[PDB]
Ligand binder design. Structure first.
Ligand code: BJB
Length: 257
Protein backbone atom coordinates (compact mmCIF):
# COMPACT_ATOMS: atom_id res chain seq x y z
CA UNK A 1 0.00 0.00 0.00
CA UNK A 2 2.37 2.71 1.22
CA UNK A 3 5.04 1.05 -0.93
CA UNK A 4 2.74 0.92 -3.95
CA UNK A 5 2.07 4.59 -3.21
CA UNK A 6 5.77 5.47 -3.27
CA UNK A 7 6.29 3.39 -6.42
CA UNK A 8 3.37 5.03 -8.24
CA UNK A 9 4.71 8.51 -7.40
CA UNK A 10 8.28 7.59 -8.35
CA UNK A 11 7.14 6.28 -11.74
CA UNK A 12 5.19 9.49 -12.37
CA UNK A 13 8.37 11.40 -11.52
CA UNK A 14 10.50 9.37 -13.94
CA UNK A 15 7.76 9.54 -16.59
CA UNK A 16 7.32 13.33 -16.57
CA UNK A 17 10.76 14.90 -15.97
CA UNK A 18 13.45 14.91 -18.65
CA UNK A 19 16.35 15.73 -16.29
CA UNK A 20 16.65 13.54 -13.19
CA UNK A 21 19.20 14.03 -10.43
CA UNK A 22 20.70 10.70 -11.51
CA UNK A 23 21.41 11.95 -15.03
CA UNK A 24 22.51 15.38 -13.80
CA UNK A 25 25.02 13.85 -11.39
CA UNK A 26 26.49 11.75 -14.21
CA UNK A 27 27.19 14.90 -16.23
CA UNK A 28 28.37 16.99 -13.27
CA UNK A 29 30.95 14.37 -12.22
CA UNK A 30 32.18 13.02 -15.57
CA UNK A 31 31.05 9.56 -16.66
CA UNK A 32 31.08 16.91 -21.04
CA UNK A 33 28.95 20.06 -20.98
CA UNK A 34 30.10 23.21 -22.72
CA UNK A 35 30.99 25.85 -20.14
CA UNK A 36 29.25 29.22 -20.52
CA UNK A 37 31.27 31.71 -18.48
CA UNK A 38 31.33 34.98 -20.47
CA UNK A 39 29.76 36.76 -23.44
CA UNK A 40 32.10 34.95 -25.83
CA UNK A 41 31.16 31.42 -24.73
CA UNK A 42 27.49 32.33 -24.29
CA UNK A 43 27.30 33.34 -27.96
CA UNK A 44 29.06 30.12 -28.99
CA UNK A 45 26.50 28.08 -27.04
CA UNK A 46 23.65 29.80 -28.89
CA UNK A 47 25.08 29.11 -32.35
CA UNK A 48 24.65 25.35 -32.07
CA UNK A 49 26.87 23.83 -29.39
CA UNK A 50 23.99 24.12 -26.88
CA UNK A 51 20.97 25.75 -28.53
CA UNK A 52 12.22 33.58 -27.42
CA UNK A 53 11.02 37.19 -27.43
CA UNK A 54 13.08 39.73 -29.39
CA UNK A 55 16.67 40.15 -28.26
CA UNK A 56 17.39 43.06 -25.93
CA UNK A 57 20.68 42.56 -24.08
CA UNK A 58 22.87 39.86 -22.59
CA UNK A 59 21.29 39.88 -19.13
CA UNK A 60 17.74 39.86 -20.50
CA UNK A 61 18.70 37.05 -22.88
CA UNK A 62 19.82 34.92 -19.93
CA UNK A 63 16.53 35.82 -18.24
CA UNK A 64 14.56 34.67 -21.29
CA UNK A 65 16.39 31.34 -21.32
CA UNK A 66 15.77 30.73 -17.62
CA UNK A 67 12.16 31.87 -18.05
CA UNK A 68 11.58 29.32 -20.81
CA UNK A 69 13.04 26.47 -18.76
CA UNK A 70 10.89 27.25 -15.72
CA UNK A 71 7.78 27.47 -17.92
CA UNK A 72 8.67 24.01 -19.24
CA UNK A 73 9.23 22.75 -15.70
CA UNK A 74 5.78 24.13 -14.85
CA UNK A 75 4.33 21.98 -17.64
CA UNK A 76 6.11 18.86 -16.37
CA UNK A 77 5.03 19.50 -12.78
CA UNK A 78 1.43 19.92 -13.96
CA UNK A 79 1.56 16.50 -15.63
CA UNK A 80 3.30 15.05 -12.56
CA UNK A 81 0.56 16.34 -10.26
CA UNK A 82 -2.16 15.07 -12.61
CA UNK A 83 -0.52 11.63 -12.72
CA UNK A 84 -1.34 11.36 -8.99
CA UNK A 85 -4.86 9.84 -8.99
CA UNK A 86 -5.76 11.53 -5.69
CA UNK A 87 -4.73 14.94 -7.05
CA UNK A 88 -6.70 14.49 -10.27
CA UNK A 89 -9.83 13.86 -8.17
CA UNK A 90 -9.76 17.43 -6.84
CA UNK A 91 -11.79 20.05 -8.67
CA UNK A 92 -9.83 21.62 -11.51
CA UNK A 93 -9.87 25.00 -9.76
CA UNK A 94 -8.35 23.49 -6.61
CA UNK A 95 -5.78 21.78 -8.84
CA UNK A 96 -4.89 25.20 -10.27
CA UNK A 97 -4.55 26.65 -6.77
CA UNK A 98 -2.09 23.97 -5.63
CA UNK A 99 0.06 24.44 -8.74
CA UNK A 100 -0.11 28.25 -8.55
CA UNK A 101 1.43 28.35 -5.06
CA UNK A 102 3.48 25.15 -5.37
CA UNK A 103 5.39 25.01 -8.65
CA UNK A 104 8.13 27.48 -7.75
CA UNK A 105 8.75 25.59 -4.51
CA UNK A 106 9.10 22.32 -6.41
CA UNK A 107 11.11 24.01 -9.17
CA UNK A 108 13.64 25.37 -6.68
CA UNK A 109 13.89 22.00 -4.93
CA UNK A 110 14.58 20.26 -8.24
CA UNK A 111 16.94 23.07 -9.27
CA UNK A 112 19.35 21.70 -6.66
CA UNK A 113 19.60 18.50 -8.74
CA UNK A 114 21.29 20.32 -11.65
CA UNK A 115 23.38 22.68 -9.49
CA UNK A 116 26.71 22.63 -7.69
CA UNK A 117 28.57 25.45 -5.94
CA UNK A 118 30.05 26.65 -9.26
CA UNK A 119 27.11 26.66 -11.68
CA UNK A 120 24.17 24.77 -13.14
CA UNK A 121 23.33 22.65 -16.15
CA UNK A 122 21.44 24.10 -19.10
CA UNK A 123 19.89 22.61 -22.24
CA UNK A 124 19.35 19.00 -21.16
CA UNK A 125 22.77 19.12 -19.54
CA UNK A 126 24.68 19.84 -22.77
CA UNK A 127 25.75 23.18 -21.27
CA UNK A 128 26.97 24.47 -17.92
CA UNK A 129 26.69 28.13 -16.88
CA UNK A 130 29.10 29.30 -14.20
CA UNK A 131 27.91 30.95 -11.00
CA UNK A 132 30.52 33.64 -11.71
CA UNK A 133 28.87 34.58 -15.01
CA UNK A 134 25.38 34.86 -13.49
CA UNK A 135 26.85 36.99 -10.70
CA UNK A 136 28.43 39.32 -13.29
CA UNK A 137 25.15 40.12 -15.05
CA UNK A 138 23.49 43.52 -14.82
CA UNK A 139 21.32 44.12 -11.77
CA UNK A 140 18.75 43.09 -10.86
CA UNK A 141 19.19 39.94 -12.94
CA UNK A 142 22.34 38.99 -11.01
CA UNK A 143 20.35 38.96 -7.74
CA UNK A 144 17.76 36.37 -8.83
CA UNK A 145 19.77 33.15 -8.86
CA UNK A 146 22.21 33.57 -5.95
CA UNK A 147 19.71 32.73 -3.16
CA UNK A 148 18.80 29.55 -5.06
CA UNK A 149 22.43 28.39 -5.06
CA UNK A 150 22.73 28.90 -1.30
CA UNK A 151 19.62 26.79 -0.75
CA UNK A 152 20.68 24.17 -3.30
CA UNK A 153 24.14 23.72 -1.75
CA UNK A 154 22.61 23.00 1.66
CA UNK A 155 19.78 20.92 0.17
CA UNK A 156 22.17 18.63 -1.71
CA UNK A 157 24.04 17.98 1.55
CA UNK A 158 21.07 15.76 2.43
CA UNK A 159 22.04 13.61 -0.59
CA UNK A 160 18.51 12.66 -1.62
CA UNK A 161 17.91 10.59 -4.74
CA UNK A 162 15.16 10.67 -7.36
CA UNK A 163 12.98 8.28 -5.35
CA UNK A 164 13.02 10.73 -2.43
CA UNK A 165 12.47 13.82 -4.59
CA UNK A 166 9.33 12.33 -6.15
CA UNK A 167 7.61 12.12 -2.76
CA UNK A 168 9.17 15.38 -1.57
CA UNK A 169 7.82 17.21 -4.63
CA UNK A 170 4.41 15.56 -4.28
CA UNK A 171 4.18 16.83 -0.70
CA UNK A 172 5.15 20.35 -1.81
CA UNK A 173 2.30 20.53 -4.32
CA UNK A 174 -0.42 18.98 -2.13
CA UNK A 175 -0.22 21.66 0.54
CA UNK A 176 -3.41 22.22 2.53
CA UNK A 177 -2.84 25.83 3.61
CA UNK A 178 -2.70 27.41 0.16
CA UNK A 179 -4.88 30.54 -0.12
CA UNK A 180 -8.26 30.03 -1.73
CA UNK A 181 -8.50 26.24 -1.51
CA UNK A 182 -12.07 24.93 -1.60
CA UNK A 183 -11.58 21.46 -0.09
CA UNK A 184 -8.91 22.01 2.55
CA UNK A 185 -9.63 18.75 4.46
CA UNK A 186 -9.34 16.68 1.28
CA UNK A 187 -5.96 18.16 0.32
CA UNK A 188 -4.61 17.85 3.86
CA UNK A 189 -5.66 14.20 3.86
CA UNK A 190 -3.75 13.58 0.63
CA UNK A 191 -0.68 15.40 1.96
CA UNK A 192 -0.68 13.34 5.15
CA UNK A 193 -0.60 10.13 3.10
CA UNK A 194 2.28 11.47 1.00
CA UNK A 195 4.18 12.56 4.11
CA UNK A 196 3.67 9.15 5.72
CA UNK A 197 4.96 7.59 2.50
CA UNK A 198 7.95 9.95 2.60
CA UNK A 199 9.06 9.01 6.12
CA UNK A 200 8.34 5.36 5.30
CA UNK A 201 10.44 5.60 2.13
CA UNK A 202 13.26 7.44 3.92
CA UNK A 203 13.47 4.79 6.65
CA UNK A 204 14.16 2.14 4.01
CA UNK A 205 16.27 4.20 1.60
CA UNK A 206 18.33 6.07 4.23
CA UNK A 207 18.60 3.76 7.26
CA UNK A 208 21.56 5.61 8.80
CA UNK A 209 19.95 9.04 8.29
CA UNK A 210 19.52 11.06 11.48
CA UNK A 211 16.51 13.41 11.48
CA UNK A 212 16.21 13.28 7.68
CA UNK A 213 12.40 13.40 7.69
CA UNK A 214 12.08 16.42 10.02
CA UNK A 215 14.91 18.16 8.17
CA UNK A 216 12.93 17.84 4.93
CA UNK A 217 9.87 19.34 6.64
CA UNK A 218 12.07 22.29 7.58
CA UNK A 219 13.32 22.41 3.98
CA UNK A 220 9.71 22.76 2.83
CA UNK A 221 9.33 25.83 5.04
CA UNK A 222 12.60 27.21 3.69
CA UNK A 223 11.29 26.81 0.13
CA UNK A 224 8.20 28.86 0.95
CA UNK A 225 10.40 31.74 2.14
CA UNK A 226 12.60 31.38 -0.94
CA UNK A 227 9.59 31.67 -3.26
CA UNK A 228 8.24 34.68 -1.35
CA UNK A 229 11.51 36.55 -1.87
CA UNK A 230 11.62 35.30 -5.47
CA UNK A 231 8.12 36.63 -6.15
CA UNK A 232 9.18 40.04 -4.85
CA UNK A 233 12.23 40.12 -7.14
CA UNK A 234 9.98 39.33 -10.11
CA UNK A 235 7.47 42.01 -9.12
CA UNK A 236 10.25 44.59 -8.86
CA UNK A 237 11.54 43.54 -12.28
CA UNK A 238 8.00 44.03 -13.61
CA UNK A 239 8.04 47.63 -12.32
CA UNK A 240 11.59 48.70 -13.19
CA UNK A 241 12.49 46.54 -16.21
CA UNK A 242 9.49 47.49 -18.35
CA UNK A 243 11.40 46.39 -21.47
CA UNK A 244 11.78 42.80 -20.22
CA UNK A 245 9.02 40.46 -21.40
CA UNK A 246 7.44 38.44 -18.58
CA UNK A 247 5.69 35.20 -19.50
CA UNK A 248 1.91 35.51 -18.96
CA UNK A 249 1.79 32.17 -17.12
CA UNK A 250 4.37 33.30 -14.57
CA UNK A 251 2.51 36.61 -14.29
CA UNK A 252 -0.69 34.83 -13.22
CA UNK A 253 1.29 32.78 -10.68
CA UNK A 254 2.77 35.93 -9.10
CA UNK A 255 -0.46 37.92 -9.48
CA UNK A 256 -1.56 37.71 -5.82
CA UNK A 257 1.58 36.91 -3.82
O1 BJB B 1 9.53 34.27 -13.05
C1 BJB B 1 10.17 33.19 -13.15
O2 BJB B 1 10.13 32.34 -12.21
C2 BJB B 1 10.99 32.89 -14.40
C3 BJB B 1 12.42 33.42 -14.24
C4 BJB B 1 13.25 32.47 -13.38
C5 BJB B 1 14.71 32.95 -13.40
C6 BJB B 1 15.20 33.93 -14.26
C7 BJB B 1 16.51 34.09 -14.01
C8 BJB B 1 17.57 35.04 -14.65
C9 BJB B 1 19.00 35.02 -14.17
CL1 BJB B 1 20.20 36.11 -14.91
C10 BJB B 1 19.39 34.08 -13.09
C11 BJB B 1 18.35 33.17 -12.48
C12 BJB B 1 16.87 33.21 -12.99
N1 BJB B 1 15.75 32.52 -12.62
S1 BJB B 1 15.66 31.28 -11.43
O3 BJB B 1 16.57 31.47 -10.30
O4 BJB B 1 14.36 31.19 -10.77
C13 BJB B 1 16.05 29.78 -12.36
C14 BJB B 1 17.33 29.77 -13.14
C15 BJB B 1 17.69 28.55 -13.95
C16 BJB B 1 16.75 27.33 -13.97
N2 BJB B 1 16.86 25.94 -14.70
C17 BJB B 1 15.71 25.15 -14.39
S2 BJB B 1 14.82 26.00 -13.44
C18 BJB B 1 15.51 27.34 -13.21
C19 BJB B 1 15.13 28.59 -12.38
Amino acid sequence: DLKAFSKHIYNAYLKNFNMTKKKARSILTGKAPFVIHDIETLWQAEKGLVWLPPYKEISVHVFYRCQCTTVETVRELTEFAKSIPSFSSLFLNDQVTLLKYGVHEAIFAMLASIVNKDGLLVANGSGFVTREFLRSLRKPFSDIIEPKFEFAVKFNALELDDSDLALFIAAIILCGDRPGLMNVPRVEAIQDTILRALEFHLQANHPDAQYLFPKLLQKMADLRQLVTEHAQMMQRIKKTETETSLHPLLQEIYKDM
